[PDB]
Each structure stands twice: as structure tokens, then as C-alpha cells.
Design a protein around this ligand. Sequence first.
Ligand SMILES: [Cu+2]
Length: 657
Amino acid sequence: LAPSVVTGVAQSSPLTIVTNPKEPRQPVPASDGADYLKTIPGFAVIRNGGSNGDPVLRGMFGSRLNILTNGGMMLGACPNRMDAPTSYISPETYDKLTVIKGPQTVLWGPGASAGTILFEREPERFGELGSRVNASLLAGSNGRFDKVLDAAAGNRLGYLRFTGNHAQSDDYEDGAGNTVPSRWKKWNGDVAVGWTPDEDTLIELTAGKGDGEARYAGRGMDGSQFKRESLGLRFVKSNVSDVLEKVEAQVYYNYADAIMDNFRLRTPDPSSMMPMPMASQVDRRTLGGRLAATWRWDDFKLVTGVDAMRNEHRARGSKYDMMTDYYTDADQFPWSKDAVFHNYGAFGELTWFAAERDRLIGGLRLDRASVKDYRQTLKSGHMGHAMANPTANDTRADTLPSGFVRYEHDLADSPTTLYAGLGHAERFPDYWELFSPKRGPNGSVNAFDKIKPEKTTQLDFGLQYNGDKLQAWASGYVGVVQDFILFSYREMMGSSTQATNVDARIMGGELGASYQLTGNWKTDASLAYAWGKNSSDDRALPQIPPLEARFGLTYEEGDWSAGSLWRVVAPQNRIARDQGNVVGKDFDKSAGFGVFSLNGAYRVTRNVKLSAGVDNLFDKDYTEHLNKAGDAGFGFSANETVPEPGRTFWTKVDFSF
Ligand SMILES: [Cu+2]
């Protein structure tokens, strides 16, 4: 019951991880959902700068992970992804983080070929009048301050709750003492009044605001705003009937409003392109909903339901007077909408509790996806001159069925669990894969017209051991991807992208173990590996993270613990130069490295606990393979992968009344 700083999370269920995001973590994470995922084998991150990095599971990027917030989808607005759905997540304000790896549920949304990611606040629960409160201040290296506060009130009949937070940091320094252009600033706020007449009933109303900024070393333009709004409603009922157990119906509305410029967080680099002040305001509106009933009756259980979603994108950008010098910011011009996405689907997950020692799970879902191209001109003539968009007001759709079957079995003698499982998944294309690139497949009108859905057929096997003193888990995967969406780069003349559809093989795994040595000594270990190949070009896939290992040693006695952790990462030699995705590209083979860190935590009293840690003790100078290239407007020669941070100190008090 001693405290602890989190250095890793073992696999709880098969293919499932469940962590508490309110616990302190060793490589101390930004106010950002991608960072609270680094602590789970299988997860790399594209560094942009301070925060707001693009998550990556088993080498797969972007929408292939289905990243949810209270069951609802929080989508970004920028066409280059400086606001991935993680950028609007501050995980501290959430109670639970589940991750389902591989395409092994149909319950939570469409076309999660790579994996599923859940951020949940669990409903408040009282009994008599009451009031909880938790708070955490956090301070460390480089002007880093994080406040966070969660607070309830209510009784048997209802409740009210306010989570919020505020975080920020200044430009950090790398291992060679450079100042990396990468501050940030963030705040969130969320009310949640909930009504609970019988103990078999619940409604919940959720309003939220949020905003933030982020300097980006990797790009020629900074986030000076990622405003958010969010309203939503959740309805659930317990035991309608001897068979019908739950009825879950809910709605969400998530609006993302994101200004992005080159003058409010930096001076415009006159040297090359964009020597002009330029803003670009963009927004993204999301409405969607979900309805599911559950039926436990026999050695059997079944979740069937439908859901649907619609989202809308609009953009508008400054113009500069090249000759009189009268900048006119982008808000004085009309919101110019450009894309609309629709989805409707119906799903089912049937579970068979054969024996104690055998389970069977099989899920199916059918989806109907649609998108309309609302852009009338396209900025892509000569010097980007206005051209007639040959897909103006067009609209395509598709009905895309996914499914899976998983077989878990518990060995007779020892606490071991084996599991194999097959799954097939189809994903309609992204905003950024349809609209962002400047060229579609090789002989086409644009990308919207020709890019094809992505079909992934993946095999997921693995095992679990829950010993008295030894815990160990293994998850592996081998699978193939049809019409994998892929980006290609080439040198007003910046760099131009071509999205194509290629055929690709993939395979990898993760594995981990922890051993309880003495009652005070604990050692833990975790390994993570990914492999991917472009089958239709006899070449490796781009942007795959190289082999990675982490070794943990901790000591604890009743009231406190301390620990140290070892991260060693192999070099990536399989690259795909000038091929990547909408945020980034493979260019150069990466260098292995290792980085050591130290943590400790100390429980003062029932209500207050204390931890602190040191990050990258020996101040290693290193950069990670996935990280972007640096602007060269901050001093970045050629394709300089944006460096990691150096040695770093942080401390954090966790209050809990
Ligand atoms: Cu942007």
C-alpha cells in the first residue's frame, strides 16, 4: 500500500490494459493523452515539441486507433494534425484508461484496425450527502507548473462534479544544452450534474470548455489556440428484465476551434518560404451518439446496438498585403466549410462462457460511411493558384463490415491464460487522407475521388501468467493490410504529398513481466516490437518505431518507495525515405540509445502523498525515430529530428479529501 511512480502498465485482461491516469508517471507526461500512453508497451509518439504528439500503436498511425473520451469522439481541426484527438485530452481529469489492442471490439466505433483507447470518468456514487475532492500541484524543470482539481457533491438521489486543470511549461533543453522551441499552456473545465432516482437509473449532463497553445519545433507555424466546447448526455438503466440488464444510450457534441500562425509565438523566418505573417483558423464540429442493450441469460451475454456520427470541417486563413503591409487576420473573413463526414453502424458482441476455463467471443458490425467534398476552388494551380475543384459537392459512401473472434483458454494446473483471435476491419478514409494531400493516386483527379477504404485482417495471439510472485503477459500479432493509405513527399514551392493505396504486411508483439523478490524489492520488465512491409513496393513501411525495452527496479517499505528505470531503444534501420504520413516522413535511419531515470514517492498522511522524480539522469542527448524534422527557422540543419528533453526534475503533491 506504499505509494509508487508509474513506469509501465502490464496487460490486465487479454489484449487489454487498464490504468489510473491520476497516478504519477516517471517520464513525466505533458497535459496530453499521448504521453499517458507511452507507459504502455506498444505505444510510440511523434514529438511535435512540448506536448500534443501524435500517438502510434504497433506502428499504426492516426485514425487506426479509435481514441474516445467518455464514449465520444473528440476530433481535431488542423489539416496537418497539430491537434490530434489527444491534444484536447488531459488524462488527469479521467478516472480510467482502457486500451483494447488490435481490431478486437466492434462496440466503440468504426474501423479501429489498430486498437481502441478509452478515457472514462466513472459516474459519481454517493449514499447520504457527501463530497470528495482531489487535487494535484506539480512543478519541475523548465517552468513546468500543473494544477488539477476534481470535486464532487451529492447524495443517493443526484450529484454535481467539477473537474478542471491547468498546465504549462517553457521551452525545454535537450541533452546538448540546446533550447528546443516548445512551450505550451493548457486548461480544461468540465461540469457533470447527474440524476439517479432509483438505484437502477442514471442521466448525466456534461458540459466542458478547454483551450491551449503549443509552440511546434517541427513545423513552420505554431498553435496559438485549440479552443474546445463540449456538451453531452448519458442514459443508462439497470435490469429492465430478467434477461435485459443494461440499456446504454448517450449523445455527445464536441467542437474544436484552432487558430495557428507564425507571428504570435515566433517571429516569421524571412529566410525561406512564409516570410509573411500568416494565420489560419480552422474548426471542426462533431455530433454523434450510441445506443446499446446487454443480454445476459445463459452461459451467455450479448451487447447489440447501433451508433452514428456526423462531423463538419471549416477553414479560413489570413491574407497579407505584399506591398502596403496591412495584415488582415483570418477572423474578418467567412468560415469556408470544406468537408462533411457521416457514419451509421450497428454492432454486436456475443460472449460464450463455455467452461470456467474456456471463453469465446465473436463480434460483428456493419457501418455506412459517407463524405461530401464541399470545396469549390482548390489552392493548387501554378504557385498554388486557384483551380476549379473537379470534385466540388461530390459525395461517396460505402458499407464496411468488421468483425472478430477470440478464443481464451485457461491452462489447468497453473494460473496461465492462452488466447488466439482473428479480426477483420475496414476503415473509411480520414479528413486528412482525403482532403489534406496535394495529389491523389497516380492517375486521378484528386485524392478524395480515388483513395480506397483500408481493410486490415490481423491475427492476435498471446498469453498471461498470474503467479504468486511472478506476473507475465505476452501479446503478439501478424496481419495484412489492404489498400493501406500512405503518403509520399517531394520537393509557392514547399513540399507536396501524394496519398496512395498500397498492400502491406505487419507483425510484432509486446511482452512483460514483474517479479516480487522480497517484500520490499520489486523488479519489472517490458519489451515492445513492431514490423511492417510495403508488399506492393518490396520495401519496408515508413514510420515504424524501433525495438524498445524498459527495465524497472523498485524498493518500498510501508510508507514510501523509490525506484529506477532503464529505457534502451534499438536503432531503426528499416525506413522508407520520403514516405510517411500527413504529419511526418521517414528520412534517415535512427540511432539506438538508452535513458535512465529515478523516482520515489512518500505517503505523508491519509489525505496527502508526495512523489518526485528525475528524468534522464545522465542528461542523454537523443532523438526518437518518429519525431518530426525541425523547422530550420529555429536553427535546424537539414532533416534534424526534433530532439528529446535532457535531464529534468519534477515534484507533485496529491491531495485527497
Ligand atoms: Cu496547424
